[PDB]
Design an enzyme around this catalytic site. Structure first.
Site, PDB file in Angstrom:
ATOM      1  N   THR A 159     -54.715  16.877  20.440  1.00 47.99           N
ATOM      2  CA  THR A 159     -56.002  16.558  19.915  1.00 47.99           C
ATOM      3  C   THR A 159     -56.617  17.213  18.899  1.00 47.99           C
ATOM      4  O   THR A 159     -57.056  17.143  17.943  1.00 47.99           O
ATOM      5  CB  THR A 159     -57.138  16.330  21.009  1.00 47.99           C
ATOM      6  OG1 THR A 159     -56.393  15.120  21.841  1.00 47.99           O
ATOM      7  CG2 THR A 159     -58.294  16.208  20.594  1.00 47.99           C
ATOM      8  N   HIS A 309     -53.925  10.663  17.226  1.00 46.40           N
ATOM      9  CA  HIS A 309     -52.574  10.495  17.759  1.00 46.40           C
ATOM     10  C   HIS A 309     -52.492   9.534  18.836  1.00 46.40           C
ATOM     11  O   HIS A 309     -53.628   8.833  19.111  1.00 46.40           O
ATOM     12  CB  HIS A 309     -52.207  11.741  18.536  1.00 46.40           C
ATOM     13  CG  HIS A 309     -52.877  12.257  19.685  1.00 46.40           C
ATOM     14  ND1 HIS A 309     -53.313  11.585  20.927  1.00 46.40           N
ATOM     15  CD2 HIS A 309     -53.981  13.345  19.795  1.00 46.40           C
ATOM     16  CE1 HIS A 309     -54.293  12.171  21.537  1.00 46.40           C
ATOM     17  NE2 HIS A 309     -54.700  12.954  20.875  1.00 46.40           N
TER      18      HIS A 309
END
Ligand SMILES: *[C@@H]1O[C@H](CO)[C@@H](O[C@@H]2O[C@H](CO)[C@@H](O[C@@H]3O[C@H](CO[C@H]4O[C@H](CO)[C@@H](O)[C@H](O[C@H]5O[C@H](CO)[C@@H](O)[C@H](O)[C@@H]5O[C@H]5O[C@H](CO)[C@@H](O)[C@H](O)[C@@H]5O)[C@@H]4O)[C@@H](O)[C@H](O[C@H]4O[C@H](CO)[C@@H](O)[C@H](O)[C@@H]4O)[C@@H]3O)[C@H](O)[C@H]2NC(C)=O)[C@H](O)[C@H]1NC(C)=O
Ligand SMILES: CC(=O)Nc1ccc(C#Cc2ccc(F)cc2)cn1
Ligand SMILES: [Ca+2]
Ligand code: NA
Ligand code: NA
Ligand SMILES: [Zn+2]
Length: 806
Positions: A159, A309
């Site tokens: 992240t 992602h």
């Protein structure tokens, strides 16, 4: 200490954070335990929920409510987002037909369309098709605006490395957030997800979009949101900021959602529990667009919907343990899970040895689900090496797996069904991009691109000059209706020499020999034309590459190939040749096996010599233009020139010879001809950038012949493969690779088999963008084509990934 005894009265979500120990009212004070006493009461009102109902219409303003349905709420900028729909007969933004936004349609006093970045954590690319039934607001943004089928994150696919890449345009190795756990040996400090250390500015390198904006006098909303601020309140805060007066109003805003990542960890990417978090995100998007439409900003604001992602299926029972490989397990520190990083537990123990750690982890079990690498041997496309926070030893973990130190770490540290962090080429890690607004195109699909490219575009959207970054500015111009940035080609720094015949054979003392004296105005008129560049239009299809640094080099022409020969490095910087679909592979005749021939255009003192290879027991040599692909027996002699020779470990020659004997011709058959440009790379300090000569750490023993760390090829053909590579009228198609030049094939567990079982698999793992080869060589390719420069920049950032179709 914070004297939290001041008040948030009139300061809720104030834009500049005030210096301790005055108490704070900004969107991050909760995170630092530093808000004024009345922050919750004043700034986080929840009374009556988030939606107007019929009966609140025209209500008497009650300042306790979360949002308002009273007649004054529009001037006050704090209606519930559905206010006009419930109380004024208006339609929801998602119910309206889409209509092209050809120009910005803004209220007075707006100097430029605002940019709002809606970032979603864990939002896997295939959710756009697979969840399309439950996301009508997102599906409208996607079908009306500009979208890619997916957007490639950076490695590792965690992240904060990805969000900060979005904000800076830099690889993680340059911005410095290289994982979700880090040790910096210079600070002697650690960064963790839980904690206050992660807030220290010195972790965060580069210049993020909010700082770029501010320095150039564009105001920015604060990007970071405390976890306990609910999404509805984040949206209302952004909409309130949008009602500020002109001189105080930001032009850039970010929203962030912890979902669907949160639920994906627990349920897996396609768990039945995942439908609801996708519904809820869509409803948040709906709130934002209804709010913008209320403010009359829905045809004025550029909105980006972007993920950091994806999310893969990962469970407890797919964990590899380093205790099943190593005996000294307690002398190591492992950063575990979807990638591994290994370092010594103590700087005071000099018995810990990286080389034997690596060997104990290499091809040890038949089905091994991770591969160890020294960081500098990782695929160059990962750009994951040049930072002291990245440990020398790395484990690339197969998708669907974890790695852990000891089984106890997994049941005393199942709990989870999804995770991410894997190689950024993996299909499950791909994420999303949608751009909607006056500056984006209408109903346009664009090819997949990398997230390192967005910072440039966000700067373009805001009229800002980007700080120096890793994007290629102009490569995403095809996303934009206007504000494009008109890049120009870099200037060539070094001009080549064009040497003629200048040396007699007897001047060379290179210890080379060739069986070539088995030696006509028909065929000598021809030899001369071939050495002047008569077949250059066949082998050099896109112009000579430009040399972007100061150096001394020669263009050498031949029947079958052209090269740019470096007098400094004693070898070509590039060699260019075209193989038509019809070409034949021939062998190296037995009497020519060890043939090397002096090149009478290049002085002895600037040539390699054969004696150095003879005396260097570890090092052999290969050729850049391959003898197997010579156009005729006589042309073949050209392939044995000492100016076409390059140093290669024997183990590497196995790979190179297979590529050159088998694969070039396979590609030419499949692609209807190919043009190949190949050459050496030197990156001994692993910074992704070409080494100067004084950085070379290895030479062919007793010579000044530098040993490359890598070899590249760029293989170009016609995108319309009905046209032959050498006669192509339109867009090009490219694949490229950067193979590490290693003395063993330890990377390939199947290497003792036939090259047909392992070589192409290795090449695929080392796939690269032309742009990566450019940084590594100081060359600029495709300088003469009939294509637009923007299109060529998009081709240079292309990566051929070899994944199946998403
Ligand atoms: C991707 O895109 C980026 C950005 O363009 C490229 O990175 C840049 O590369 C150039 C060329 O190497 C670097 O120039 C050198 O810079 C220093 C000055 O250093 C400071 O100023 C700059 C400018 O404001 C900062 O951005 C620097 O930030 C780095 O360090 C701090 C910690 O101090 C950290 O917070 C950042 O994350 C960042 O770390 C990364 O970079 C450093 C190297 O700078 C590296 O050690 C680390 O591993 C990280 O990756 C910094 O505060 C200057 O002193 C140098 O001069 C020296 O070399 C010359 C040669 O001409 C000598 O003669 C001279 O004596 C000096 O010794 C360099 O000019 C630039 O800093 C760097 N920028 C960033 C943001 O990383 C990448 O190259 C691109 N990648 C690819 C593959 O293309
Ligand atoms: C508690 C917690 O983690 N909060 C949190 C985390 C991340 C962010 C972000 C971001 C962002 C970066 C770049 C962009 F272009 C857009 C958005 C905001 N809040
Ligand atoms: Ca380098
Ligand atoms: Na010989
Ligand atoms: Na040798
Ligand atoms: Zn996650």
């Amino acid at each position: 200490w914070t004297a939290t005894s001041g008040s948030c009265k009139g300061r809720c979500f104030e834009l500049q954070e005030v210096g301790p120990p005055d108490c704070r009212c900004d969107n991050l004070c909760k995170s630092y335990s530093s808000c004024c006493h009345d922050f919750d009461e004043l700034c986080l009102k929840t009374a009556r929920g988030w939606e107007c109902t019929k009966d609140r219409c025209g209500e008497v303003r009650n300042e306790e409510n979360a949002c308002h349905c009273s007649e004054d709420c529009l001037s006050r900028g704090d209606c519930c987002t559905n206010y006009q729909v419930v109380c004024k007969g208006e339609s929801h933004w998602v119910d309206d037909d889409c209509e092209e936004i050809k120009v910005p349609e803004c209220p007075a006093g707006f100097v430029r369309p605002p940019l709002i970045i809606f970032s979603v954590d864990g939002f896997r690319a295939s959710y756009m098709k697979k969840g399309s039934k439950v996301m009508p607001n997102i599906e409208k943004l996607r079908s009306c605006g500009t979208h890619a089928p997916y957007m490639r994150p950076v490695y590792p696919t965690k992240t904060f490395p990805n969000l900060y890449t979005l904000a800076t345009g830099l690889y993680p190795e340059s911005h410095g957030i290289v994982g979700n756990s880090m040790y910096d040996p210079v600070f002697d400090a650690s960064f963790h997800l839980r904690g206050r250390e992660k807030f220290n500015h010195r972790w965060w390198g580069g210049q993020p979009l909010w700082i770029t904006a501010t320095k150039q006098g564009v105001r920015a909303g604060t990007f970071f949101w405390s976890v306990s601020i609910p999404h509805e309140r984040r949206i209302l805060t952004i909409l309130q900021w949008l009602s500020l007066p002109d001189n105080e109003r930001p032009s850039v805003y970010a929203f962030y959602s912890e979902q669907p990542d949160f639920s994906g960890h627990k349920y897996g990417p396609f768990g039945p529990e995942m439908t609801n978090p996708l519904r809820e995100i869509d409803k948040t998007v709906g709130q934002l667009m209804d709010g913008l439409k209320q403010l009359r900003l829905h045809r004025c604001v550029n909105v980006i919907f972007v993920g950091d992602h994806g999310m893969e299926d990962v469970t407890c029972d797919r964990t590899e343990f380093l205790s099943n490989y190593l005996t000294n397990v307690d002398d190591i520190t492992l950063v575990p899970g979807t990638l591994g990083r290994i370092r010594a537990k103590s700087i005071n123990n000099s018995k810990y040895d990286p080389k034997t750690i690596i060997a104990a982890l290499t091809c040890k079990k038949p089905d091994q689900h991770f591969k160890p690498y020294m960081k500098q041997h990782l695929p160059k496309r990962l750009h994951y090496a040049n930072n002291r926070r990245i440990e020398d030893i790395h484990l690339l973990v197969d998708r669907r797996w974890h790695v852990a130190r000891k089984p106890l770490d997994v049941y005393k540290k199942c709990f989870f069904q999804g995770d991410h962090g894997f190689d950024n080429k993996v299909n499950s890690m791909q994420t999303v991009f949608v751009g909607y607004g006056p500056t984006f195109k209408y109903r346009t699909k664009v090819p997949p691109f990398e997230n390192i490219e967005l910072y440039n575009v966000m700067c373009d959207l805001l009229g800002l000059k980007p700080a120096p970054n890793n994007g290629t500015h102009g490569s995403l111009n095809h996303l934009l209706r206007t504000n494009t940035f008109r890049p120009t080609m870099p200037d060539e720094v070094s001009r080549p020499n064009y040497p003629g015949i200048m040396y007699l054979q007897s001047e060379f003392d290179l210890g080379c020999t060739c069986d070539d004296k088995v030696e006509n105005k028909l065929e000598e008129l021809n030899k001369r034309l071939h050495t002047k560049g008569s077949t250059k239009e066949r082998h050099l299809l896109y112009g000579r590459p430009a040399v972007l640094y100061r150096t001394s080099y020669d263009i050498l022409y031949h029947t079958d190939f052209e090269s740019g020969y470096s007098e400094i490095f004693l070898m070509p910087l590039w060699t260019s040749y075209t193989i038509s679909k019809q070409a034949e592979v021939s062998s190296i005749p037995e009497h020519l096996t060890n043939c090397v021939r002096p090149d009478v255009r290049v002085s002895p003192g600037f040539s390699q010599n054969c004696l150095a290879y003879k005396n260097d027991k570890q090092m052999s040599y290969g050729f850049l233009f391959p003898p197997y692909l010579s156009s005729s027996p006589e042309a073949k002699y050209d392939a044995f020139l000492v100016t076409n020779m390059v140093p290669m470990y024997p183990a590497f020659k196995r790979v190179w010879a297979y590529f050159q004997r088998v694969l070039v011709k396979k590609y030419a058959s499949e692609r209807n001809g190919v043009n190949v440009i190949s050459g050496p790379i030197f990156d001994y300090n692993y910074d992704g950038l070409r080494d100067t000569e004084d950085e070379i750490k290895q030479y062919v023993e007793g010579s000044s012949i530098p040993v490359p760390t890598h070899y590249y090829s760029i293989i170009t053909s016609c995108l319309d493969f009905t046209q032959p590579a050498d006669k192509c009228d339109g867009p090009l198609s490219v694949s490229s690779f950067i193979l590490p030049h290693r003395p063993d094939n330890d990377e390939s567990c199947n290497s003792s088999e036939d090259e047909s079982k392992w070589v192409e698999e290795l090449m695929k793992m080392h796939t690269a963008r032309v742009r990566d080869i450019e940084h590594l060589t100081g060359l600029d390719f495709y300088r003469k084509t009939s294509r637009s420069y923007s299109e060529i920049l998009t081709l240079k950032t292309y990566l051929h990934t070899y994944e199946s179709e998403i």
